[PDB]
C-alpha cells in the first residue's frame, strides 16, 4: 500500500523495524513511530485536528481515537507509540462512535457562520462532519460566545470558531520562536490570546492562518475576497529572498488572490515568511505597462516598442565601449541575465554585474558563495557561528531552520556583527573583525566550544562582500574553518548566505563587476530591474534605460522605460543560497504592453546590430549550458567539487570598521514589496 500522501519512510537500519497490523494488514514501521504514523504508512487516513507533523504532540482534540486490541479505552493514535504485534482497528463501531461523539462535542458551541467564514469550502471541520459524524444535531441550549482579539494587520480573528486545538500556541513557541500567544483561563471558557494588547510581530506569523483548522485565524488582507473553489492553483517559487521557498499562487482571472506555502522538505517545510505571503498586493500596483521616452519638457510619453528600441539602439552606438554599463536586478531570472551579459560583452564592455553587496566577489569557486551545508544539513550542526549576517531578516526560512535545530538538538549559536534581535538564545561574541582575530587566535570559551564541536557550521553573510577588507575577512574566516576542521569529506560546515534571488545565478553566470567605479564613468546605463542601485552615482549626462515592472528612483532618472514581466507572469530560472536551481511557473497574464526581460534584451540586441545565436528561451538555456550547466539541470542536489585549498594566499590587513546591517526593513526589500499596502502597514505597525 502507498503511504498517505506518498510519505517517505527512512530506516536507519532494518533491524530497527517493528511489525504492526492496521485493519488486518501487515505494515513495517521504524521504532518510535506512533499509531497514527503507522496508519499513514498503511494508507489509512485518520482524522485529526490538534496533531501536526511539524509540531509537538498535544493529544487534546480526541478526534484521532482508534481501537487497539487488548486496550480498554479508545486510543489517541497521534500520541500512542506503536508496539510490535499491535492490532490497530480504525473502522470498528467503537472508533466510529467515538468519532461521532467527539464531532458532536466539537460542533456544540461552534458558530453557525459557514457562509461568512473564509474557511468554508476548505474546512477540515466541514469535511469530517460530512464524513465521520453524519449525526443530526441535537444540542438546543445556548452556545457560548467569545469576543474577537486584535493581533495586527495580518491575522484576522473570529474566536467563536476556535476549537482550542492549541496549534497556534505551539507554533508560536516552537517554530516562530516568539512566545506571544497562549491559552488563558480554564474549562470551556478558556480563550486563545495574548492577554495584554500586542500584535504578532514574528516574521513567520502568517503561518498560523495555514495551521488553524477553522476560520478562527484568517488572512485579513484576503478577508471575504474569494472562495477556494474559484481559485486557480499554480505551483511556483518565491523571489523575495535567496531562499527559493516553494509556494502555491492562487489566482482568479488575471489577478493573484493569495499566496500560501508549498511543501518542500529541503527548503521551507510548508512554511513561508510574511513578506512572501503578503507581497502579492504590489503585483497590481504602480505597474510599468508601456514603453516611455521622456519628452521635450522632461516628461514621460507612451510610445510603441519599435520607437523606444530604435531610440536605445541609436544612442548606444554613440558611446565608447567601456562606457556601457549593465546592471541586473535582484529579481532577474537566469535567462535574462545571460542575454544581458551576452549583449553587453558583444558591444565591447565587461561592466555587467548583479545589484547588491556581492557585485564584485570572486566567483571562481562555487563553494565560496553558497551554503555548502545545505538548509536540511543545518539540522545536523551542533554549533552555529554567524559572521556579519542577520538571518532573521535576510533569509527567514534559514533562520527558522536554525531556530528549529537549536530547539531540538540544543546547538549553540555565536554571533559576530551589529546588535540584533534573535528568536533564540545566542552569545554576542563581538561586532566586527577584531572578534574574528580573537576567534582565530583562540583563548576564549567560544573558541574551545567551537573546537569541542563535532559538526560546527559557520555562516558568513553576503553583506560583508562589499567591504574594502573583504579578502582579509574571507581569509580569516577560512583560517578559522581550517583550524577547527570545519570542512571535511563527511561534513562541509562552511557557508555563505546570499540575500537576493538572482545572486546565485548571476555569480554562476559570471556577472562580476571588474571596474569598481565603472558606474561613475558610464554614459549608457542599462538597469534591468536594478531598482536598488544608487542612481546619484550615475553621471547626470548618462543615458539611463530602465527595464522592469516597478520602480521609484531609477524610473525618475531613466530616459527610457521598458515594461517587463513579473515573476508570477513568466517561466524563469532561479538559484537559491544552497545552489538549488528551480523554475517559476506562469500563473497570470502580463499587464499592458509588458514583455519578458530576456525577450526585451534580445530584441534590443537585434535592433542595436548585434546578432545573438538564439531566438527562444530554449536557445538561451542551451547557451547557458556552455557557461553554468548547473543552471539548466533544474531540481538537482550536487556536492561541492573543490574547496578552500585552491584559494591563493592573501596578506591584506584587517580593517576596524564594524559589520553593518544589510536589511534595514524586512518588509521593504524589493520593488514589488515597496508597492504594496500591506507591506507598508506592516512597516508602520509591526516594526
Amino acid at each position: 500500500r502507498n503511504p498517505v500522501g506518498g510519505a517517505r519512510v527512512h530506516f536507519s537500519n532494518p533491524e530497527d523495524a517493528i511489525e504492526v497490523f492496521v485493519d488486518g494488514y501487515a505494515v513495517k514501521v521504524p521504532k518510535g513511530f506512533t499509531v497514527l504514523q503507522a496508519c499513514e504508512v498503511a494508507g489509512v487516513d485518520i482524522p485529526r485536528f490538534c496533531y501536526h507533523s511539524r509540531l509537538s504532540i498535544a493529544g487534546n482534540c480526541r478526534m484521532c481515537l482508534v481501537e487497539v486490541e487488548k486496550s480498554p479505552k479508545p486510543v489517541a493514535s497521534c500520541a500512542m507509540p506503536a508496539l510490535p504485534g499491535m492490532k490497530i482497528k480504525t473502522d470498528t463501531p467503537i472508533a466510529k462512535k467515538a468519532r461521532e461523539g467527539v464531532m458532536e462535542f466539537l460542533l456544540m458551541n461552534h458558530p453557525l457562520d459557514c457562509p461568512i467564514c473564509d474557511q468554508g469550502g476548505e474546512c477540515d471541520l466541514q469535511d469530517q462532519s460530512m464524513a465521520f459524524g453524519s449525526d443530526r444535531g441535537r444540542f438546543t441550549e445556548m452556545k457560548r460566545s467569545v469576543v474577537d482579539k486584535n493581533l495586527g494587520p495580518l491575522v484576522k480573528t473570529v474566536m467563536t470558531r476556535c476549537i482550542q486545538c492549541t496549534r497556534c500556541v505551539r507554533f508560536a513557541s516552537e517554530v516562530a520562536g516568539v512566545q506571544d500567544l497562549g491559552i488563558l483561563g480554564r474549562g470551556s471558557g478558556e480563550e486563545i490570546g495574548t492577554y495584554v494588547e500586542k500584535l504578532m510581530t514574528s516574521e513567520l506569523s502568517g503561518n498560523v492562518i495555514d495551521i488553524c483548522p477553522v476560520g478562527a485565524l484568517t488572512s485579513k488582507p484576503f478577508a471575504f475576497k474569494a472562495r477556494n473553489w474559484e481559485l486557480k492553483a499554480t505551483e511556483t517559487i518565491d523571489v523575495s529572498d535567496a531562499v527559493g521557498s516553494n509556494i502555491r499562487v492562487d489566482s482568479r482571472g488575471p489577478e493573484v488572490m493569495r499566496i500560501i506555502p508549498r511543501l518542500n522538505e529541503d527548503i521551507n517545510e510548508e512554511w513561508i515568511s510574511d513578506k512572501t505571503r503578503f507581497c502579492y498586493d504590489g503585483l497590481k500596483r504602480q505597474r510599468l505597462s508601456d514603453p516611455m521616452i521622456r519628452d521635450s519638457d522632461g516628461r514621460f510619453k507612451a510610445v510603441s516598442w519599435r520607437d523606444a528600441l530604435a531610440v536605445v539602439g541609436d544612442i548606444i552606438h554613440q558611446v565608447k565601449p567601456d562606457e556601457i554599463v549593465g546592471v541586473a536586478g535582484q529579481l532577474s531570472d537566469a535567462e535574462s541575465m545571460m542575454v544581458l551579459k551576452d549583449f553587453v560583452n558583444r558591444m565591447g564592455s565587461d561592466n555587467v554585474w548583479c545589484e547588491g553587496t556581492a557585485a564584485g566577489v570572486d566567483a571562481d569557486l562555487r563553494y565560496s558563495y553558497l551554503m555548502n551545508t545545505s538548509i536540511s544539513g543545518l539540522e545536523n550542526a551542533d554549533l552555529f557561528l554567524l559572521i556579519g549576517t542577520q538571518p532573521r531578516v535576510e533569509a527567514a526560512m534559514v533562520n527558522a531552520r536554525i531556530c528549529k535545530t537549536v530547539r531540538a538538538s540544543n546547538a549553540k549559536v555565536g554571533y559576530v556583527g551589529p546588535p540584533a534581535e534573535f528568536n533564540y538564545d545566542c552569545k554576542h561574541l563581538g561586532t566586527g573583525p577584531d572578534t574574528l582575530k580573537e576567534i582565530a587566535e583562540g583563548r576564549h570559551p567560544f573558541c574551545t566550544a567551537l573546537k569541542n564541536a563535532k559538526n560546527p557550521a559557520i555562516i558568513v553573510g553576503a553583506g560583508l562582500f562589499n567591504r574594502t577588507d573583504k579578502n582579509a575577512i574571507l581569509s580569516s574566516v577560512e583560517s578559522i574553518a581550517q583550524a577547527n576542521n570545519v570542512v571535511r569529506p563527511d561534513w562541509n560546515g562552511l557557508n555563505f548566505l546570499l540575500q537576493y534571488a538572482a545572486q546565485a545565478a548571476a555569480l554562476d553566470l559570471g556577472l562580476i563587476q571588474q571596474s569598481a567605479k565603472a558606474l561613475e564613468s558610464a554614459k549608457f546605463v542599462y538597469l534591468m530591474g536594478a531598482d536598488d542601485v544608487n542612481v546619484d552615482k550615475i553621471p547626470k549626462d548618462a543615458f539611463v534605460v530602465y527595464q522592469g515592472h516597478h520602480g521609484d528612483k531609477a524610473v525618475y532618472r531613466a530616459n527610457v522605460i521598458l515594461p517587463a514581466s513579473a515573476f508570477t507572469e513568466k517561466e524563469g530560472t532561479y538559484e537559491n543560497t544552497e545552489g538549488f536551481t528551480q523554475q517559476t511557473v506562469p500563473a497570470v497574464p502580463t499587464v499592458g504592453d509588458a514583455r519578458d526581460d530576456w525577450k526585451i534584451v534580445r530584441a534590443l540586441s537585434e535592433v542595436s546590430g548585434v546578432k545573438l545565436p538564439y531566438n527562444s528561451i530554449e536557445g538561451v538555456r542551451s547557451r547557458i549550458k556552455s557557461v553554468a550547466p548547473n543552471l539548466v539541470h533544474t531540481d538537482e542536489r550536487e556536492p561541492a567539487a573543490f574547496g578552500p585549498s585552491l584559494k591563493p594566499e592573501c596578506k591584506e590587513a584587517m580593517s576596524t570598521t564594524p559589520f553593518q546591517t544589510v536589511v534595514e526593513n524586512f518588509y521593504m526589500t524589493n520593488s514589488i514589496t515597496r508597492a504594496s499596502k500591506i507591506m507598508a502597514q506592516c512597516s508602520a505597525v509591526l516594526l
Binding site: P111, M142, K143, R144, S145, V158
Partner: protein, 73 residues
C-alpha cells in the same frame, strides 16, 4: 460614501446600507450574551448568532449588522 459602496452604488439620493445600519442605536441587553436571528420569525432571518457583550464597545452581529450592548455593565 466609502470606497466599498462607491464600487456599485451610483445614486446618492438615498443613504447607503452602511450609513443606514450605523444609525440604528445599539440594543441594550440584560446579560453578557445575546442571540441574534435578524428577524422576529427566525426562519425568515439569518442563521442564529450568539454574541458576547464583555467589551465596552458595542458588539456587532456579523450577519445583519445589529449592535448590542450590556444594559447595566
Amino acid at each position: 460614501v466609502g470606497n466599498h459602496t462607491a464600487k456599485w452604488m451610483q445614486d446618492r439620493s438615498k443613504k447607503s446600507p452602511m450609513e443606514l445600519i450605523s444609525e440604528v442605536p445599539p440594543i441594550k441587553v440584560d446579560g453578557r450574551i445575546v442571540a441574534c436571528e435578524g428577524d422576529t420569525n427566525p426562519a425568515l432571518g439569518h442563521p442564529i448568532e450568539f454574541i458576547c457583550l464583555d467589551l465596552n464597545e458595542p458588539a456587532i452581529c456579523k450577519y445583519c449588522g445589529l449592535r448590542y450592548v450590556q444594559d447595566h455593565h
